[PDB]
């Protein structure tokens, strides 16, 4: 599955990966800058903590950057 990955926000082919994911979460700058954004790939949709939002999809290059 080919997914967008950071910091390059470019498409990359992930062996053994089945899902693209966009993971957003606040750091110390969430109030000034915005919610940290991480683009990646995984074999299963990652389990996240409470304040961390995640969006998983199965298409190729389906985790672009908002």
């Amino acid at each position, epitope marked *: 599955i080919r997914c967008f990955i*950071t*910091p390059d*926000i470019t498409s990359k082919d992930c062996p053994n990966g089945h899902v693209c994911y966009t993971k*957003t979460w606040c*750091d*110390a*700058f969430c109030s000034i*800058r*915005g*919610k*940290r*954004v*991480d*683009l990646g790939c995984a074999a299963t949709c990652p389990t996240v903590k409470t304040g961390v939002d995640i969006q998983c999809c199965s298409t190729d290059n389906c985790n672009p*950057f*908002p």
Partner: nanobody
Amino acid sequence: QVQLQESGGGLVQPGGSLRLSCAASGDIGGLKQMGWYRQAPGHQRELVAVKRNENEANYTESVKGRFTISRDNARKMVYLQMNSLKPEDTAVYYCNAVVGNWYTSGYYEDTYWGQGTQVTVS
């Protein structure tokens, strides 16, 4: 969030050699650049060496051929080999690291600094 911790400084005679190491830990996701600067009494934090990912190392022409910067990215560390030390090289050396990260509003770079380690030559 980001900790730079240094080590390797000390006292040496003219012509001796040292090896400083700076370890980065924490939210080093997107670590993008790392450098060693010096500061002696009365000086500013002056450039000694720097290495930006996917760029060639840059040195100050006062240390070319004598110092050597290197980055181990699996360990997330930067090291400075200081050969043929001379008295003018005496100062507190700091390691800075520039980390780059994406937010909903865009990609920002931030500079974090190290505790600083003494290097004396006499």
